[PDB]
């Protein structure tokens, strides 16, 4: 498959091929709107490892945010507000320049039958997943709020627990 090559090629972000493409695409994205719909992922390998399927009900939106919160976290929340009928699945860095970091957000339509009938993505239709990006439940949101397994990562201390037989 060609996805292995795309994943190995995405590691050389400053090679002649990738640096040239970054220049042309960053210029292209700045000509467009701050948030624009993407007809297809620029990194199909990256999108699909994040949950993206080339089926009806999956939507890719491109957004640019200014550098200098996490820019990825800002990208998801602004795109989620822009398309308020969708569910923010995930997001990935696509490009950057001196002023802008560029991200593609993966969204899913919960009212589409192709999503409501797919057992691998039904969970996002359930109403507990309204605005996962607004509650920190995305991949970047979990990492930002310190959620993680290990030792690196209140109320039971501020409360006095008085039992009946004390």
């Amino acid at each position: 498959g060609a996805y292995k090559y795309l994943e190995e090629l995405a590691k050389k972000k400053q090679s002649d091929v990738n640096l040239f493409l970054s220049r042309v695409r960053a210029w292209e994205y700045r000509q467009m709107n701050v948030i624009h719909r993407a007809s297809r992922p620029s990194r199909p390998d990256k999108a699909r490892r994040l949950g993206y399927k080339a089926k009806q009900g999956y939507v890719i939106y491109r957004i640019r945010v200014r550098r200098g919160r996490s820019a990825r976290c800002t990208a998801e929340e602004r795109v989620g507000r822009y398309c308020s009928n969708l569910r923010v699945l995930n997001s990935y860095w696509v490009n950057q320049d001196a002023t802008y970091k560029f991200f593609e957000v993966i969204l899913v339509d919960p009212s589409h039958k192709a999503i409501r009938r797919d057992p691998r993505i039904n969970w996002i239709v359930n109403p507990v997943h309204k605005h996962r990006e607004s509650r920190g439940l995305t991949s970047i949101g979990k990492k930002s709020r310190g959620i993680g397994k290990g030792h690196r990562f209140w109320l039971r201390h501020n409360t006095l627990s008085l039992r009946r037989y004390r």
Binding site: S111, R116, R117, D118, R120, N122
Partner: protein, 121 residues
Amino acid sequence: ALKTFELRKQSQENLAEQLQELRQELASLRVQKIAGGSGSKLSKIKTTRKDIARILTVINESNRLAAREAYKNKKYIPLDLRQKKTRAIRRALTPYEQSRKTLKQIKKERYFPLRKYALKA
């Protein structure tokens, strides 16, 4: 007064002429109230108002049952003919698609379902 079952045993234009007659009678009775009426006329006002309501109810249900008949077995039906439970229930996954499974999980429950068993003491 007007009985609902005999009202439902009539046709729509007959129900319309009865409604028009009752509206005239109500108008005359309210004219009698301003000119000075008796308790019988004032009591007849409420009965006429309920009789108008019953005729309007029968006309509306007959109209809506016709709409339900026209749209029976159609993919799309009028919003007022659709279910109204709650907004959230309407957005919920249906029992069918809430029970959709991958072939992978279908094979697992086909070949290794939870067994019935017991432990002897």
